[PDB]
């Protein structure tokens with residue numbers, strides 16, 4: 098009675114309906130035959146996300162500990178990553194979140210509004226021809242320029258950063274090319290850190306160096322791991338939020354009208370896109386330190402849990418009978434948790450909301466008649482089981 102996730106992501110819509118149906122705790126299989134549990138309902142997901150018995154520490158994974166996980170298992174980079182904010186819980190995690198919150202403040206993100214507006218303008222200025230790949234030509238570059246600027250990376254590096262991001266995020270990318278891509282990116286982050294120690298500025302890197310709580314502060318290794326984690330966490334997710342809002346407005350033309358008229362605000366489009374069509378379908382991975390009741394089921398000690406944000410986004414218990422539809426007018430007594438919940442909640446939420454909040458009005462300002470150059474049915478998800486990313490967004494600028 099175990100749902101196997103399509104590594105080709107041929108039918109997300111259905112796979113998400115099957116996960117919602119298989120109760121709050123669904124037995125699933127990850128690509129490579131690895132069995133785990135998925136929490137697929139909203140209220141149960143919030144309970145597990147704040148339960149200190151669900152930890153990131155891979156030592157707690159019984160299957161891993163007793164060697165039944167292939168060392169070449171494709172998803173092992175997700176299950177077993179380098180030490181960061183991502184992989185710790187309890188006091189160690191609270192220390193990192195406190196220090197990071199001092200640097201990536203709502204104020205610092207809000208202060209990016211003008212630079213993002215200018216980066217959006219220049220990308221739109223480069224769009225030419227009657228149809229474009231709006232993903233490759235507009236959405237894709239925007240978050241790279243934004244994060245480079247946020248982090249204070251040498252503007253000279255941007256042409257190479259474009260190539261390193263493509264390599265880091267690409268399916269095709271081979272074995273010891275991805276080793277070498279990580280190495281080069283870490284070298285850039287280390288240079289940026291050393292630059293900002295010598296000459297502190299108004300950038301996130303400078304603030305991560307300055308952050309402290311009663312004389313406790315981040316190590317160089319902690320600062321670099323934080324900058325790398327933010328690039329990994331923030332790039333394709335923000336692209337897919339923009340891509341998915343354009344896809345949603347295009348297939349709900351009466352809501353596009355409502356937003357273009359000024360009756361509906363852009364925030365309502367972004368918040369609805371996040372609930373209805375999150376860029377992050379699944380987050381790996383947590384392990385139970387003890388048996389944990391979830392509904393009428395038990396998550397056993399040493400078993401794995403994934404959080405199925407995609408599926409639970411359209412949870413009718415949270416969002417009512419409309420849950421399964423895109424509606425930017427909707428009222429929910431339950432805010433979406435597409436940025437997570439509890440200690441590990443996304444620290445980038447304000448920034449991705451700001452990028453989309455600037456990009457979407459700017460694009461429709463330049464091309465208010467823009468639409469899909471192809472039927473919605475022809476749009477393809479990339480073969481990335483944890484993400485909701487499209488190969489391309491063919492658009493007629495109009």
Ligand code: HEM
Nearest residue numbers: 182183327330331334335338380435436437441443445449
């Ligand atoms: C639409 C865009 C994004 C979405 C949908 C997204 C979603 C998420 C979610 C769901 C989590 C928590 C996963 C869990 O614990 O179950 C998370 C964590 C994180 N995200 Fe975001 N995120 C987005 C953008 C960004 C941006 C722009 C940045 C960085 C500036 C970022 C950095 C992070 C980091 C560092 C974490 C790890 C937090 C921790 O474990 O303590 N994300 N993201």
